Design an enzyme around this catalytic site. Structure first.
Site, PDB file in Angstrom:
ATOM      1  N   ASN A   1      32.145  -4.146  50.736  1.00 10.51           N
ATOM      2  CA  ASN A   1      33.372  -5.092  50.290  1.00 10.51           C
ATOM      3  C   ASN A   1      32.560  -6.159  49.069  1.00 10.51           C
ATOM      4  OD1 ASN A   1      35.033  -4.074  53.005  1.00 10.51           O
ATOM      5  ND2 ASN A   1      35.261  -2.840  50.906  1.00 10.51           N
TER       6      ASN A   1
ATOM      7  N   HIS B   1      30.937  -8.772  50.367  1.00 13.95           N
ATOM      8  CA  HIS B   1      31.214  -9.558  51.427  1.00 13.95           C
ATOM      9  C   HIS B   1      29.228 -10.364  51.523  1.00 13.95           C
ATOM     10  CE1 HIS B   1      35.171 -11.306  51.290  1.00 13.95           C
ATOM     11  NE2 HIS B   1      35.459  -9.637  51.242  1.00 13.95           N
TER      12      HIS B   1
ATOM     13  N   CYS C   1      29.606 -17.061  53.516  1.00 11.96           N
ATOM     14  CA  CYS C   1      28.729 -17.694  52.412  1.00 11.96           C
ATOM     15  C   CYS C   1      29.581 -16.823  51.263  1.00 11.96           C
ATOM     16  CB  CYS C   1      27.708 -17.628  52.542  1.00 11.96           C
ATOM     17  SG  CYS C   1      25.880 -18.126  51.052  1.00 11.96           S
TER      18      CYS C   1
END
Ligand SMILES: Cc1cc(C(=O)NC[C@@H]2CCOC2)on1
Ligand SMILES: Cc1cc(C(=O)NC[C@@H]2CCOC2)on1
Lengths: 268, 265
Positions: B186, B188, B223
């Site tokens: 995804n 991330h 992050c």
């Protein structure tokens, strides 16, 4: 994992993991490259090579010699999805005194169809002085008992992509990713940067829009010098065209070349 | 990989790979963490997730990690087979917990254990929330009803509060950035990448003379793909203990805090 019936190649199956896939829910080229390295290491272990991070022969250990990659060439037709089983077959061949070659064929375990292929060139190097060497007659004899005698190539075609000369990217680059540094996960058991980390660093300078609209078909990578644990790298890319790119990895400070390569991408 | 006889836990075996081991020829804690994530994903898939429930997809909700706690007694060597058992438990409206037991496949001995806390979050607004009654009912059919804990002890490490490291740090690793291999499907940053970044500020002399026994990591903020992180470490202590902080390179916004315990080899 097991040697085939004749004992001149090795096969191993892998189930593609959740963290091993990209935005397309299929294995990244770095996952594929790690799987090639894994089946290569399992093949070397099965035929009696050292189990200390360096798959050296008895004569290489006597002369303090190691094998180092000079070139990696990978072509993928279909990337396996998360949960799929991929079967990989690997074998080695002597190339006279120049060095050795390790080849791979990737297949879909369910259909038996070839989904990819790879070839790599390895050279002899003294591990203390880091000086390249020709392959001795004694190590040629040791390799011959585990390699096919008649030529077997993943890329047989006369004048194919895997053997093309790669030029040096000239400044200014079209794209760049600066200040890339390895972390402990990028090192191997001997504390050297993993060969696959360099593939990731090359790919870092490809624009995200290319990665989102295209799939990587071919990557050819030359290895010229190693990146140390405390080194910093700049990854440079220029379009040469399907979409084709020329790549250069060099040390962040003095600009010393560490790798050069090319990639071919097909529109999704 | 398979659900156990009662269908309330999942087991999977893994052969430790050549590139998965460190300088000691045994699996890194990051390899262990990736294996935990893999068996967690296989468990969720086996019980019908995709990992969100039917009510979570209706309300645009996702599970996010709040804390990861791992304790390793013996790291498996290259070529060894490690068996991992995982299960989930609801913790009322606070969130859910995923636990793991690691065993040596040959001896049957427990070589490690881990526990993690997960919280509900709206995918769009990034706002945390309590677990609704409907979500709790869906989880109950796949979780044990009597409590089962990887860390049952009275004053166990997995629940200790972690303080904020005060400047100046004893050690630091600056300008850490994620690359495409650090992202998930995804896009991330993978939860395991943060463990690697924490460990980057430990001196190489500690890693060479000690083995990592325990790591507790709090997750406070994500992050982003284009963010840059600074990893800070201060010794708090035959064992060595450290306090850790990961913060954004620019403004100093906290992303994680944690502690590690190391024993002399
Ligand atoms: C990518 C990639 C693939 C390999 C590889 O096959 N390495 C293991 C061999 C075992 C015998 O020595 C070398 O390395 N990098
Ligand atoms: C470390 C670590 C371990 C996990 C994990 O268990 N991931 C799968 C969960 C179950 C399905 O939803 C998420 O993630 N990071």
């Amino acid at each position: 994992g097991s040697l085939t019936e004749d004992g001149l190649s090795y096969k191993e199956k892998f189930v593609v993991r959740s963290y091993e896939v990209g935005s397309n829910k299929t294995a990244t080229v770095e996952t594929i490259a790690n799987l090639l390295q894994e089946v290569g290491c399992n093949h070397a272990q099965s035929v009696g090579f050292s189990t200390d991070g360096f798959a050296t022969t008895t004569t290489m250990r006597k002369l303090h010699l190691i094998w180092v990659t000079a070139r990696m060439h990978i072509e993928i037709y279909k990337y396996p999805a998360w949960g799929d089983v991929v079967e990989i077959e690997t074998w080695c061949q002597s190339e006279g005194r120049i060095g050795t070659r390790r080849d791979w064929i990737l297949k879909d375990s369910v259909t038996g169809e070839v989904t990819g292929r790879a070839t790599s060139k390895w050279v002899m190097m003294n591990q203390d002085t880091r000086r390249l060497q020709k392959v001795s007659d004694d190590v040629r004899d040791e390799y011959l008992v585990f390699c096919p005698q008649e030529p077997r190539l993943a890329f047989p075609e006369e004048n194919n992509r895997s053997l093309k000369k790669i030029p040096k990217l000239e400044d200014p680059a079209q794209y760049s990713m600066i200040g890339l540094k390895p972390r402990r996960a990028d090192l191997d058991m001997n504390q050297h940067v993993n060969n696959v980390t360099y593939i990731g660093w090359v790919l870092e300078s490809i624009p995200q829009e290319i990665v989102d609209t295209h799939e990587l078909q071919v990557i050819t990578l030359d290895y010229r010098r190693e990146c140390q644990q405390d080194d910093v790298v700049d990854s440079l890319t220029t379009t040469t065209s399907d979409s084709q790119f020329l790549h250069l990895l060099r040390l962040s400070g003095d600009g010393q070349e560490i790798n050069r390569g090319t990639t071919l991408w097909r529109k999704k």
